[PDB]
């Protein structure tokens with residue numbers, strides 16, 4: 602089983618480079634699972650505080666599957682504005698919530714295949730939902746940050762072209778106890794250091810170990 606060189610120390614350096622650091626009240630674990638899924642569906646192209654503001658405005662009215670289905674599209678749009686792609690997210694949340702009401706007893710699904718079939722729910726959100734809502738490690742949630750950093754550090758046997766290719770390559774060697782945590786670490790690492798353009802390699806602890814920085 603192939604594994605990249607120096608990956609242990611590289612992850613140690615990413616842990617040291619992170620910046621400085623609440624938990625919300627849920628009426629029941631079942632309602633929490635729905636709100637966990639909704640926050641994942643709202644975060645696309647959105648700063649975390651804007652997503653939290655939308656979640657706070659939804660909770661202030663009562664954030665359940667039934668109350669969402671009783672909220673018309675225009676009202677739901679004003680509530681989640683200005684999250685990115687808010688008009689599409691209104692459609693995704695209403696259609697998903699109707700699926701959960703009809704077929705899942707108001708709960709969220711408990712498998713990746715069923716989650717990614719929901720409107721506006723991709724494999725990245727599905728693996729995060731499995732970990733956060735059900736406590737299940739089903740896979741690695743690969744966004745553009747994880748895909749870029751894994752290829753810069755050569756954490757894949759060969760360079761991958763798509764995020765789900767990166768997921769399959771990372772899961773072949775990455776220990777399973779790190780599958781959930783690696784998403785939050787690399788997302789932050791890509792946001793503050795390993796930038797999409799002009800990465801801050803001069804101030805990165807991985808420069809002497811990074812194949813991208815060395816060539």
Ligand code: SF4
Pocket residue numbers: 753754794795796800801802803805806807808811812813814
């Ligand atoms: S040296 Fe540059 S490319 Fe390599 S991990 Fe650090 S920021 Fe990313």
